[PDB]
Structure 1
Amino acid sequence: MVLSEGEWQLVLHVWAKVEADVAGHGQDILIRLFKSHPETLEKFDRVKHLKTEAEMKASEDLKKHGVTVLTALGAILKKKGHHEAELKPLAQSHATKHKIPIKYLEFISEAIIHVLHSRHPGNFGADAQGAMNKALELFRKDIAAKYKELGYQG
């Protein structure tokens, strides 16, 4: 797939608002993920044990994870499709070490869209949501292909 410049602009315009508060958005997104799809929490040996949303909010380790995920995703989106170098190490750890099925990347994509929609309604109308979904589909498609080369296509 290929986004147009206009679609990239919509994506990077709402992302610039996310970056005003990386840790807060990280928290919202992962908590939304873990509430919606509790199986995903099992992948994090560090936060596995957390039982409630209050515990999740209070967790410093969860908030670090969120910042790590969003910073890596931000660097990828800012490449505007030319992200082959950033993807390689990421596809290798998630295929071989963490073992994150593509289905889980779909779930977090849903969580990202949900949280942007709540927090940024004026900058996240239909066309901006369409452009973000396209960017995240592109990301999942390129990851899935690398998974296959690495022997996982999990």
Structure 2
Amino acid sequence: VLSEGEWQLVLHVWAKVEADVAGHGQDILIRLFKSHPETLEKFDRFKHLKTEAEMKASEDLKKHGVTVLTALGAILKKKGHHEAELKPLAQSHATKHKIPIKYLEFISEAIIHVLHSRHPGDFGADAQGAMNKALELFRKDIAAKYKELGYQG
């Protein structure tokens, strides 16, 4: 749906996030985990995790932010013609993971806070919205598939 220009904005921020992937993932992760305790409850490999200290301390977390950020970018860069990557994920998330669209949204949040937090100058409003647009988009499709599938309350 989103504009030539908007993709523009959405993309350059990416390239920046690409500078320190693991950092960001860790970031987003922690944000998410702190803000929506429910979300972490769902990762078996992480539940053990008690403090912010612990989190940033743990390497498997690290790796984890990585796994995610990667899939994420892959989609962005596709400027909406992201089907290739999304499908599998929607299935994965709906069928084993058990992740609520609410999470996608949740996560989505930490994402932009994180982005904001880490790029004061680079990310004013023009960027912020593009970014948000992009996200609901990811949100939209993954939602659809869910339906198809019988998920999505």
Root mean square deviation, CA, Å = 0.7
* SS of residue paired to 2:20: helix
* 1:151 Cα deviation after fit: 1.8
Q: Distance in 2 between matches of 1:85 and 1:150?
A: 17
Identify the residue that residue 41 of structure 1 maps to in structure 2: 40
What does the per-residue CA deviation read over 1:25-63, in whole Å, with 9 as the maximum and x for residues that have no partner?
Answer: 000110000001111111110011111000001111111
Q: Distance in 2 between matches of 1:71 and 1:140?
A: 17
**Seq. identity, %:** 99
TM-score scaled by length of structure 2 = 0.98
Q: Distance in 2 between matches of 1:112 and 1:52?
A: 20
* 1:113 Cα deviation after fit: 0.4
> Equivalences for 1:8-19 in 2 at 5 Å?
8-19=7-18
Structure 1: runs of 5+ lacking an equivalent: none
TM-score scaled by length of structure 1 = 0.97
What does the per-residue CA deviation read over 1:124-148, in whole Å, with 9 as the maximum and x for residues that have no partner?
Answer: 1011001000000111011000111
Moved over 6 A (4+): none
Identify the residue that residue 90 of structure 1 maps to in structure 2: 89
* SS of residue paired to 2:84: helix
* SS of residue paired to 2:53: helix
* 1:24 Cα deviation after fit: 0.5
> Equivalences for 1:73-112 in 2 at 5 Å?
73-112=72-111
Identify the residue that residue 139 of structure 2 maps to in structure 1: 140
Q: Which moved more, 1:119-128 or 1:70-79?
A: 119-128
* 1:153 Cα deviation after fit: 1.9
What does the per-residue CA deviation read over 1:69-128, in whole Å, with 9 as the maximum and x for residues that have no partner?
Answer: 100000000000001111110000100000100001110000000011011111110110
* SS of residue paired to 1:20: coil
* 1:15 Cα deviation after fit: 0.6
Q: Distance in 2 between matches of 1:18 and 1:115?
A: 10
Q: Distance in 1 between matches of 2:96 and 2:38?
A: 17
